[PDB]
Amino acid sequence: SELLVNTKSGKVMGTRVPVLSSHISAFLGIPFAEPPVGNMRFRRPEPKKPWSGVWNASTYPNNCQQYVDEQFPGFSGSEMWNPNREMSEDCLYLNIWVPSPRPKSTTVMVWIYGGGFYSGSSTLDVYNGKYLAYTEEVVLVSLSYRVGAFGFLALHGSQEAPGNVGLLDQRMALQWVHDNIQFFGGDPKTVTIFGESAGGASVGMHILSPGSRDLFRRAILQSGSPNCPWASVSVAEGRRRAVELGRNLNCNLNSDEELIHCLREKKPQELIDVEWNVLPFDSIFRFSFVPVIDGEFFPTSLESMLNSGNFKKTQILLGVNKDEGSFFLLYGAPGFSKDSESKISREDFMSGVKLSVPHANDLGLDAVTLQYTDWMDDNNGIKNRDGLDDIVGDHNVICPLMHFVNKYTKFGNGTYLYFFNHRASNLVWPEWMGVIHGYEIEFVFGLPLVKELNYTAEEEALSRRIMHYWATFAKTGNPNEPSKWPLFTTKEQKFIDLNTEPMKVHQRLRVQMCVFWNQFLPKLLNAT
Amino acid sequence: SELLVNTKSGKVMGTRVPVLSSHISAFLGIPFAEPPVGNMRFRRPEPKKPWSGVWNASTYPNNCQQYVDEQFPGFSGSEMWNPNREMSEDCLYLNIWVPSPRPKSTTVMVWIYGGGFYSGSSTLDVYNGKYLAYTEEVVLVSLSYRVGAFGFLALHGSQEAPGNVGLLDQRMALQWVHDNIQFFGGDPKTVTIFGESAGGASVGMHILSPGSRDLFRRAILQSGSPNCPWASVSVAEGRRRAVELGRNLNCNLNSDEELIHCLREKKPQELIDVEWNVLPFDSIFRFSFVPVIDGEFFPTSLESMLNSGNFKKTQILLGVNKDEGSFFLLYGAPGFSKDSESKISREDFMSGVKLSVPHANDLGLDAVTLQYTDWMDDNNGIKNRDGLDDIVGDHNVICPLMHFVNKYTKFGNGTYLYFFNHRASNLVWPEWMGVIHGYEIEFVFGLPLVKELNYTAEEEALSRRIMHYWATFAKTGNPNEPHSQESKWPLFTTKEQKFIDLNTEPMKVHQRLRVQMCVFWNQFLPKLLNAT
C-alpha cells in the first residue's frame, strides 16, 4: 500500500490528504524516540523500541510541555504559535508528507520549529507540510524536541541532566530519517535541514556539532544563527539557572542527584510556572533554558570553532526579516501596544535599550544610545520606536547572523543570503511592527497558495518562487535553476531582497550597524 | 592737531593714512609695556614707563620672535601669516586707527591675533584696520603678545617664568586702552575684544579670568574658544615641556633658577629651533607652549568655571568656518598635498585619526574611526579625505566651541552664533581645502572693499554686512539694527539653539550646529577615555 510503510522500528499507516485540488500521503505522529517521562526527564533521548502491529499515523501528536502565550486571548496573531493540541512530556514524534505517487530517492527537507527554545510545536498550521511537498515534489519532514527545562536544564557533570537534550532529540529525529526516509521515497544522502529563529540556530548548531554533521546534506537558516546572544549559555550560567529553578520550587540543593530527583517529582506546569524567574536580568529576547557550551555536543566555544573552520562544509542559504525586533518589544518594553502606533517617549527609549542589552554597563548603553539616536530630533516618538526596533533586531538576529555568514563563507562551499522585507496584506498585527519575526514562514510553506486565506496574487507568486528557491537549493545547493540569486562571497558580499518586486542585488547588509555590534561594542565591554 | 595725542605715558605722533578715497588717522607701534628682554624674558610684563618728547607712531613695530613657516617659499597663501617686519623680543606694542575727524566717545574694538600661541603678528596686511575703522566709524586697536616659549614657558611655583605671561601681555594692553583710549576719541566703557583661533581662545580666557573682566564690555570669538583641546595644558604638562626644552639645549636641570637662567642666556632662534621637540606625541593641531591652568589667572578648571557661571556675564558673538581642519592636515598628515586632490587611502586615514586624536587609547581610536567611516564605501578616497577634515575640525574647533556656547548661554546676557561657509572666489589654496581656518578674517577687516584685490561684488557686500554685524554688535550687544528691514540674526537660546550661515546667499536660520558629532566629542568620547 502507498499508505502502509515498514520502517526499521515497525509498520506505520498514513492517510491520504487533500491539497490544492489533489492529494498526497501524510504520516503524522511517528515516534522516533522513547517517551522521556518519569525518570527519563532531563535525560538524553533513547531510540524508540520496535513495535508490533500497525502504528496509527493518521493524526497529529501531542505537543511538548511549554509556556503558553495568553497575552491576547482569541487573537490569531499570537495564538497561531500556541500548541494546537494536548501537551505532554511524551511528545517526541515527527511528521512526513510524501507526494503521491511515491517518488523514488527524492530530495528531503527537515523542518525544525523555533520558539526561543522555550516553546514551539511541529503541529502548527503555518507548518502544514502538504503544500510545499506537493508543489515542489519533495518529502517534507517536521520533527519535534523538548523545550524549556525539559529539554535544556543543564547540570554539566551529571548524566541525568547533562543539558542539550533538546538538540539531541533533533539529532535522533535526523538519525531516524537517515535510516527510514528511503522507505517513504526519500533520498537519505540528500537531506536539507531548515528552521526559523531557534530552529535556525539549531540548524546552525548541527552544522557545528561533529555528531550531527553526517546526518544531513545542506542547511537553511531563517532569522537565527548558533551565535545569537540568546541561543546559548556557559556551563556555569546553566548550572546557576538550574539551581535557581530548584530554589524557586523549594528543592533540596545539596547535590545534583538530590536536586534532580526533586525536580522530577514536580508536575510539568509547576516548572513552567517559575521558568522565567531564573533569568539574571530584566530583559527582552532572553530565555531561561537554552543550549549549553559543554565541550561535548560543542567541542569548543562557538567562535573558536568558526575561526578554525571546525564545522560541516557545504552549501547554506540564510536570511532575515526587516523588523526582527517589534514582536519582543511589544511583549516586554514600555510604551508599546498592539492597538496604537506606539510612539516611544525619550524615557521609555532609555528603559528600552537597558532591556535590550541587559549585560552592558553604562558606557555600553551610552554607546548603543548614541548609535541609534538622531540628535537633531531626539524627542520624535516614531524615530525612537524604530530605533528600538532596529536595536533589538540588529543585536539579537541580523548582526549575529551576518557574523556567522562571513565566518562560514571562508570555508563553506557556497552561501546565499536574503533580506525578507514584504508586509503581508492580511497581517493582523499593527503596522508599526512592520515585517515581523517569523512571518516569512507562511511564505516558505506555501500558505499564500490557498484561496480561503485571502492573500494577493503577487504574494502567491512570491511564495511560489520562495518555495522553489528553497526546494531547488535543497536538491542541488543552488536556489537558481539552470534573475539569478548571486552567491555571497567574502569580497563582494552580495544578497538579494525577497519581496513582490523584481529581484534586486545589494551588498554588505547593515554593515554599518553590524560593525558596531560585532566589533566595537564587544571590544568596549571587554575593555570596560 | 589730530595726529598729536598725549597719553598717560607721554606724547605720541600718528600719521594720516589714505583709505578708500578718504583718510583716517593711524597710530602705529605705540609701546604699552617694557621690552621683555634679557632678565625680563619669561617674566610678567611691566608697564611702559613715561617717555619724553613725541613718540613717532607712523610705522609698524617689530613682530615677536616666532617660528616662521617655510613649507611653501613664495606662496602667498602661507606667507601672508608670517612676520612682515623684523622679529625682536622687544615687540610689546599696539596699533590704533581713529576716524577723521576724531570721534568724541565712540565704540572701541581691540584685535587679538591668533596663530596657535606660537606665532602671529599685529602687522599683517589682513589685519590692516583702516578699512573697518573707517567704514563703521569705530576706534580699532591692534595689540600684540609674546608667543611660544617667550610668552608661555610655565614652571608653576617660580615667579621668573610663572606662565601665561602672554595672556598678561594682552591684559596690560587692554589696561592701556582702558586708561588712554579716551584720548583718541573712544569710550573705554564700550570696548569689544575680538580674535580668531588662539585669539578667540584668548578672548574666551579673558571672559573667564577675574583679572580681565573689568577691562572690556563685550566679546567676539572666531574659530576658537578657551576650552579647545590645544588652547591649554596643566601645570604638570607645562613643567614637563619646560624641562624638556632645557634638556634639548643641554641646560642645567637641577632647579628652576638654573634652568631659567640657562634659557635666558640662549638666543631667541635657539629656543625656537627645538620648540616642537617638547610635544608629547606625533600630532596635528597641537602646540608646545600655551596657557596653563595655574589657579591664578585661571581660578579653577575651565569646565568647573563654566558650570558655575564663574565668568563675565555679557553679550558674545561667536562662530566657526566650514572646514576648520584642512589647513592642519595639509601640514602634518600623510596623503595630503597642496598640488593634488588629496584622495586619502584607508591606510592614511587610519594614520590620520591616530595623529588627530593623539591622546586617545586604542578603544577611543576605534570609536572615532567608526564614527566617521561609511562602511558601505570605506576605500572612497574623497569620503576619507573629508572625514579627516571633519574629524580635525570637530575635535579641535567646532565642538569645543559648541560646548562653550551652550554653557555660557545659561548665564550670559545674549548669544549670537554663526557658521561661516563661503569659499572666496580668489583663494590661492586648493579646492579640497574648502572654507579654510582663518579665511573669514579678510571679510571681517574689509579686504573685499579694495578693488585691486579682485573680490566679487557679492563678496564686497558680504564683507560690508559682516563688518556691520560686528560693529553694531560692538556698539549695542546686538548685531541687528533695531526696526531695520534686513533679515534678523536670531539670538541663540539654550532651547532652540539657533544660528545663521554667513555667505553671499540670503540669510538662513539653522538649529543645533553639528549636534550629532558634538554629542560624540563632548559627551561620549570623554566618558570612554576615562574608563579603564
Ligand SMILES: *[C@@H]1O[C@H](CO)[C@@H](O)[C@H](O)[C@H]1NC(C)=O
Ligand atoms: C487512527 O486514528 C484515527 C483517529 O483516532 C481514526 O479515525 C482511525 O480510524 C484510526 N485508524 C484505524 C482505521 O485504525
Ligand SMILES: *[C@@H]1O[C@H](CO)[C@@H](O)[C@H](O)[C@H]1NC(C)=O
Ligand atoms: C565547492 O567545492 C568544489 C569542489 O571542491 C569546488 O569546485 C567549488 O568551487 C566549490 N564551490 C564554492 C563556491 O566554494
Ligand SMILES: *[C@@H]1O[C@H](CO)[C@@H](O)[C@H](O)[C@H]1NC(C)=O
Ligand atoms: C616718523 O617716521 C616717519 C617714517 O620714518 C617719517 O616719515 C617722519 O618724518 C618721522 N617723524 C619725525 C618728525 O621724526
Ligand SMILES: *[C@@H]1O[C@H](CO)[C@@H](O)[C@H](O)[C@H]1NC(C)=O
Ligand atoms: C540682559 O539683562 C537685562 C537686564 O536685566 C535683561 O532685562 C535682559 O532680558 C537680558 N537679556 C538677555 C538676552 O538675557
Ligand SMILES: *[C@](C)(O)CCC[N+](C)(C)C
Ligand atoms: C525564535 C526566538 O526561536 C523566536 C521565534 C518566535 N515565534 C513566534 C515565531 C515562534
Ligand SMILES: *[C@](C)(O)CCC[N+](C)(C)C
Ligand atoms: C589658531 C590655532 O590660533 C590658528 C591660527 C592660524 N592662522 C593661519 C589663521 C593664522
Ligand SMILES: C[C@H](O)CCC[N+](C)(C)C
Ligand atoms: C514574547 C513572549 O510571550 C515573552 C514571554 C512573557 N513573559 C516574560 C512575561 C512570561
Ligand SMILES: C[C@H](O)CCC[N+](C)(C)C
Ligand atoms: C601647524 C604647523 O605649521 C606645524 C609646524 C611643523 N613642525 C611641527 C614639523 C615643525
Ligand SMILES: [Cl-]
Ligand atoms: Cl486546502
Ligand SMILES: [Cl-]
Ligand atoms: Cl487544544
Ligand SMILES: [Cl-]
Ligand atoms: Cl569566497
Ligand SMILES: [Cl-]
Ligand atoms: Cl554639544
